């Protein structure tokens, strides 16, 4: 076991899906995985393991913010043999042509955090996803008849920002969605030699009907799961 | 109800104790509060309200990291009439003479986060606690016969830091405990107009690697008793 | 005409290939393009326009460094209707498993320049390429039986840096190659709403080949870039 | 004798009061000290040692700016056995409710200087005072029936700043007084291992432009009396 | 030979004049130098060596931007024994009293580049020229009946900057002209122990002339630079 | 009068020499000026005015550090009609070929202070002296048979620096001397439209006989005074 995960090697699959909400992780396990079992509950951060179409897969929450998800992704990679991390969350949109319920894939992630500068000697480290994982997700989406936008996300440290002018800047440079973790996870993946990807559904435009929104969230999860199978080939 | 808390004005007391672990909040409600009731569980971040010596009080977790606690403390202050926030967490020691189980009070908090530079035009904002709340905690401690050091804490963004040399700098400048929220909470209290204090129990030693419920009991009692003193 | 390009709207195709060495531009025009015509000579930065399998294509050098390529890419985008920019150059490697003559594609580009911080209020802007262009290049390379690595490049402001320690850091974070323009071009592309991609061939390992081997590798990179454009049109 | 002070170990008391103005140091020695003797005058920076209620005490100016006071406080600490430094200066107010003659105690000090970033690996060091010394001053104040606010001060490098908008940010974050030494003194105390506190008297108002010897008397008495309390 | 200069020790004089535009190098060699001979052609950056009133002098372009000129000046200094570098180019003005075609000498150079901070542990390095070279140029200009202004230049990384507000700041602090290399060359000179100077003619005012007037002004700048070298030899 | 100077317009000459030590200002006035009178004593920062070979000249201390000298130079320029400021002080040497008692002239000044970044939008402002003043001083020195080095000075915020490695950096980039004011004064001169120059004598090598040292300090003052007369022509 590690400081934040009370499990043992083998308890997790080599691929982990990670929503921010622990209750969302349980929702994913019950809805999409067969023969699922809980493998962690420390601090209430529920994690599970089961199978999808015969493939062993895990899902665990990572909390809100770069500092939080950095702890969990690091531990999974160095102590549980995890090779791939796929964040599945929500984001706010800044571009007008980006519509509610669009599926966004973060090929890269900008940020106002200092963690990567601390890692890269105060220079600019381009926090990017793994190319093959991005490709698998785009292909899985197409196979499901879904339109997926591929571009830059912005990982913010402050959900309630005092600098409102930074949103015009994000829009000017084409940022597709605003969330709070991608840049941190990509930094961890580079530091410890693993692979990561972040996929989001637009929840607000910096909301339609519950039925349609819930349908889109499920499509995102399907895209994640099916992208893994493609990668296996 | 706010984006991360499903409750209404009046559900929380005007003072809230906050550990990072939501499970410890539950433990605190069950162990120290009278007629405790759950007032939130969105994202599993348990919150409770009850009484201590007839005084109404709430306890809710805030998660790990400045970004996480900044969301909860802000919502409590602007939409639930909360006036005082007391963080009751754990930390890692860096000084030779600081032992496990020691209780530290952060009058100030250093950090490697950029949040305060963003608020303060890229200059140095001294993230400090409310003086009266600090004094209240020191006195409570004495009345309970429990020792407690007052000084600077260090709020880190990376629990697993790639810069190990920075611990020598922390030690050199007298950092009492390494945690991940103080500087953030102090920044929010200043921006949104409330008062705050962070108290911690050394649960691990960064140099020796020693590791430790119930261990936080002295800290928890100091926090609760300090509120009573503040009311007078 | 612009301050550095003496031409008019229409003289350039909507896609432009750009090597660092100006002399490579005329070579590409005569070796790979049909019915080529000269469209620029200011400061000796020769530009050409012709067709590749019926597709309109232009080629012109960009000079060494972020400040230089930033001028040319900006003018092409805002005044000549250019939609895509493909830089084709060389780089130096720090990873042991990356070999001389290897072809690398920069999906992202790190840098020690201050240009993007100036654009992004002093925060971290992830300088990235257009995803489809990246995928097009990968597929074109595979069709030519060539294996290409996709990852991060590092755009240095100083070819002769006083900080040797930085190369260890680049290796630790998986940087595939070191050059001097990618992050600058990606910033311009985001600023003015266009698309860009950087392809490089490993010319040296920061830590030999025949003159004929180098031309073979260079010609391979150009074929990849050109065929990648056609796939993108599909 | 050090590079900027011509005296020997024993000439200064273990506690030293320090105004920026050397002429005010002289005024303090003549007005509040018993059998005061001059122990330095290099560069005109007057220093004196005498007694207050039988207690040995020194008072010496430190000049204007963080670079100036960093030299004097360092030399006193490393070569004259000085253990406590109490700055007794003036400041400009930025908040509407802070009036001229008000006494402020800086538990913390913000700054636009780079000195602390140079000491702290370019991160945020919370420049804070010694808790006990702060408490001593608050109590002394009460015993004398004088009001005093406890909070953050701002130590500026430029008295004539080209960025007037920064005053709005200072006000927004509750800065009690604008001066030029606090953050520097607190950094030196931490680096060289001593204790410090800065007390100030609002002598001008940055917004209203109002301007004010003898005006610093309440402050001076609070400082001297706080030392006595500290000795017990 | 170095990575960007195919020549050997001795091919270059100990003093080198450098324009940004490579084409200006051949012009200077044929218009002002005697018995000139070609010494470099790599990447089309032509270099020449000859004599001016018996004094050995070389001329070669440096390209646009700090990263480009930093490569050439570094190699000339460490591998070809060059002792002095004189950049001769154009700049844009922000001060109302500074006129088109005015000759300005940069005793110092401000910048928005990060190169000197990388060299100076993130502190402020005052990028300055060699004092005697500055005085030599001033005296040479006066002897030619030309009035020259001496002050600060500003070396920009982005010709097309997204921050228009910065020009007001430059005007407030007395910046004489805006170009893109001075601060980079001054940094290299300090790093490897050599001397440098930048002379520019105002080609535009950030806020016209005949083609003949421009050649007259350009030729005036070269005469000043060349005569300044001879005064320096005294 | 101003906040730190209790005098009136006319009390100062349009050229002011400024040592760091107020007692040094009095020493300069008594030694080199005729019919000198004290024109300020606020906070003990003595200032004087008299004449040198018939030329009206003033001399006043500026205290130690950039924050201190910035206050005084600013007030002199905006409220007393001062056109030129000449700092006359001491510095520590980092270069081996730079010898004790050498006279150094700061054409430029590097610094670890943030004041100029605050002024220049966080960019690099090259803090330089006025060219004509530098020239006048070099010529005045030559006329006195003195060798004067012209180059970069380094204005430090901390006399007792915690970063000892920065001295190797200063030496590598050719800094001639280390002091604590030049960069601040040059910044003030640029902000308010005046002219400034800093001249120093090497006091230590990061000391010979008192007689020879005192002789060199006086040569520096002579250079300053005579450079003014040359400028008048
Ligand atoms: N408008 C917004 N700003 C910042 N983060 C936003 C956001 N909308 C959604 N998120 C994501 O939701 C969580 C924080 O509430 C996740 O932590 C975050 O990724
Ligand atoms: N050695 C250490 N370094 C950093 N944070 C530590 C710590 N010891 C305890 N904490 C606190 O515990 C949580 C992170 O595990 C809380 O998020 C954090 O405040
Ligand atoms: N080892 C290296 N470091 C930096 N740039 C290198 C390089 N090897 C190749 N390049 C590319 O070649 C030009 C600079 O010489 C181009 O400007 C640059 O992209
Ligand atoms: N409005 C203000 N801004 C800055 N410093 C002020 C001030 N009012 C008083 N001080 C203090 O007085 C000296 C500077 O004149 C001391 O150096 C300084 O601490
Ligand atoms: N207005 C301006 N802004 C920036 N650089 C300018 C300029 N006017 C002239 N230059 C000089 O010309 C080249 C860049 O076009 C040289 O590279 C540059 O020195
Ligand atoms: N070694 C050194 N480091 C920094 N400043 C030095 C110095 N040697 C001399 N100075 C100058 O002397 C005064 C500070 O004591 C002046 O304030 C300063 O200019």
Partner B contacted by A113 (CB < 8 A): yes
d(CA E4, CA E111): 25
Backbone angles phi, psi at A230, to 5 degrees: -65, -40
Nearest CA to C18 out of C57, C68, C60, C64 is that of C60
Non-local CB neighbours of E132 within 8 Å, separated by 6+ positions: E232, F150
Q: How many pairs of residues across E and F have Cβ atoms under 8 Å apart?
A: 99
**Chains A, F in contact: 3+ Cβ pairs under 8 A?**
no
Mutate to test the interface with D, among F22, F158, F180 (most CBs of D within 10 A): F158
B204 is catalytic: yes
Catalogue the long-range contacts made by F21-24 (C-beta closer than 8 Å, 24 or more residues apart).
F21/D43, F21/D44, F21/F61, F22/D43, F22/D44, F22/F46, F22/F60, F22/F61, F23/D43, F23/D44, F23/F61, F24/F61
d(CA C184, CA C200): 15
d(CA F231, CA F132): 8
- The residue to mutate among E171, E178, E201, E202, having the most atoms of ligand 5 within 8 angstroms of its beta carbon, is E178
d(CA E120, CA E183): 13
d(CA A141, CA A134): 11
Eight-state DSSP code of residue D44: G
Per the structure, how many domains does chain C have?
A: 1
d(CA A75, CA E162): 42
> D23 near D64, Cβ under 8 Å?
no
* Distance from the alpha carbon of residue E36 to the mean position of ligand 1, in angstroms: 67
Partner D contacted by F38 (CB < 8 A): no
d(CA F53, CA F33): 8
Rounding to the nearest 10 degrees, give the CA dihedral for residues E47, E50, E55, E61. Answer: -20
Which positions in chain F touch D67 (Cβ < 8 Å)?
A: 64-68, 156-159, 180
Q: Whose CA is nearest to atom 2 of ligand 1?
A: A92
- The residue to mutate among E65, E72, E179, having the most atoms of ligand 5 within 8 angstroms of its beta carbon, is E179
d(CA E137, CA E230): 10
* Catalytic pick among B122, B204, B218, B231: B204
Atom in ligand 1 nearest the alpha carbon of residue A65: 17
State the distance between the two ends of chain D, measured CA to CA, in whole angstroms.
Answer: 31
Contact C71 E160 (CB under 8 A): yes
Q: H/E/C letters for each residue in B170-204?
A: HHHCCCCEEECCHHHHHHHHHHHCCEEEEEEEEEE
> F148 near F197, Cβ under 8 Å?
no
Instruction: Report the chain A residue with the minimal C-alpha distance to residue B203.
Output: A3
* Distance from the alpha carbon of residue D154 to the mean position of ligand 4, in angstroms: 10
* Distance from the alpha carbon of residue E35 to the mean position of ligand 2, in angstroms: 75
* Distance from the alpha carbon of residue C152 to the mean position of ligand 3, in angstroms: 15
C91 in contact with ligand 3, CB cutoff 6 A: yes
Instruction: Report the chain A residue with the minimal C-alpha distance to residue B61.
Output: A43
CATH number of the domain that E109 lies in? 3.40.50.1580
Partner C contacted by A119 (CB < 8 A): yes
How buried is B147 (Cβ within 10 angstroms: 0-12 exposed, 13-18 middle, 19+ buried)?
A: exposed
Contact B118 A159 (CB under 8 A): no
Is residue A102 marked as binding?
no
Q: H/E/C letters for each residue in chain F?
A: CCCCCCCCCCCCCCEEEECCCHHHHHHHHHHHCEEEEEEECHHHCCEEEEEECCEEEEEECCCCCHHHHHHHHHHHHHHCCCCEEEEEEEEECCCCCCCCCCEEEEEEEEECCCHHHHHCCCCECCCECCHHHHHHHHHHHHHCCCCEEEEEEEECCCCCCCCCCHHHHHHHCCCCEEECCHHHHHHHHHHHCCEEEEEEEEEECCCCCHHHHHHHHHHHHHHHHHHHHHHHC
Domain of residue F35 covers 1-233
Partner A contacted by C121 (CB < 8 A): yes
- How many C-beta atoms lie closer than 10 Å to residue E196's C-beta? 28
State the distance between the two ends of chain A, measured CA to CA, in whole angstroms.
Answer: 32
Instruction: Report the chain E residue with the minimal C-alpha distance to residue C162.
Output: E119
Q: How many pairs of residues across B and D have Cβ atoms under 8 Å apart?
A: 92
Partner B contacted by D150 (CB < 8 A): yes
Partner E contacted by C214 (CB < 8 A): no
- How many C-beta atoms lie closer than 10 Å to residue C165's C-beta? 9
Which positions in chain A touch C108 (Cβ < 8 Å)?
A: 107-108, 126-128
Contact E44 C44 (CB under 8 A): yes
Which positions in chain F touch E120 (Cβ < 8 Å)?
A: 110, 169, 173
Q: What's the angle, vertex CA A117, arms to CA A116 and CA A123, rounded to 5?
A: 120
* CA of F232 vs chain D CAs: smallest distance (Å): 31
Partner B contacted by A132 (CB < 8 A): no
d(CA C223, CA A224): 34
Partner E contacted by C53 (CB < 8 A): no
Rounding to the nearest 10 degrees, give the CA dihedral for residues B132, B134, B137, B143. Answer: -70
* Distance from the alpha carbon of residue C204 to the mean position of ligand 3, in angstroms: 9
Residue-by-residue DSSP string for D155-166: E-S-SS-S-TTH
Q: H/E/C letters for each residue in chain E?
A: CECCECCCCCCCCCEEEECCCCHHHHHHHHHCCEEEEEEECHHHCCEEEEEECCEEEEEECCCCCHHHHHHHHHHHHHHCCCCEEEEEEEEEECCCCCCCCCEEEEEEEEECCCHHHHHCCCCECCCECCHHHHHHHHHHHHHCCCCEEEEEEEECCCCCCCCCCHHHHHHHCCCCEEECCHHHHHHHHHHCCCEEEEEEEEEEECCCCCHHHHHHHHHHHHHHHHHHHHHHHC
Nearest ligand (C-alpha, residue E43): 3
- In chain B, what is the greatest distance between 2 CA atoms, to the nearest angstrom? 49
* CA of B115 vs chain A CAs: smallest distance (Å): 7
d(CA F163, CA E121): 11
* CA of C156 vs chain A CAs: smallest distance (Å): 10
Candidates F126, F169, F193; nearest CB to E121: F169
> E110 near F121, Cβ under 8 Å?
no
Record the resolution, in angstroms.
2.1
Contact A162 B74 (CB under 8 A): no
């Amino acid at each position: 076991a590690t400081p934040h995960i009370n499990a043992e090697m083998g308890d997790f699959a080599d691929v982990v899906l990670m929503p921010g909400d622990p209750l969302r992780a349980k929702y994913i396990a019950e809805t999409f995985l067969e023969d699922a079992r809980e493998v962690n509950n420390v601090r209430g951060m529920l994690g599970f393991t089961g199978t999808y179409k015969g493939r062993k897969i895990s899902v665990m929450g990572h909390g809100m913010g770069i500092p939080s998800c950095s702890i969990y992704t690091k531990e999974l990679i160095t102590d549980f043999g995890v090779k791939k991390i796929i964040r599945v969350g929500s984001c706010g949109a800044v571009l007008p042509h980006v519509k509610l319920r669009d599926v966004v894939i973060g090929m890269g992630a900008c940020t106002d955090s200092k963690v990567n500068r601390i890692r890269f000697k105060d220079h600019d480290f381009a926090a990017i996803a793994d190319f093959d994982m991005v490709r698998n997700a785009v292909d899985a989406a197409k196979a499901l008849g879904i339109d997926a936008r591929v571009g830059n996300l912005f990982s913010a440290d402050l959900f309630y920002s005092p600098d409102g002018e930074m949103f015009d800047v994000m829009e000017k440079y084409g940022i597709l969605g605003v969330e709070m973790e991608a840049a941190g996870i990509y930094g961890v993946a580079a530091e410890f030699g693993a692979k990561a990807l972040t996929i989001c559904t637009v929840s607000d435009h910096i909301q339609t009907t519950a039925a349609e929104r819930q349908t889109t969230f499920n499509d995102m999860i399907k895209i994640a799961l099916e992208s893994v199978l493609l990668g296996d080939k």
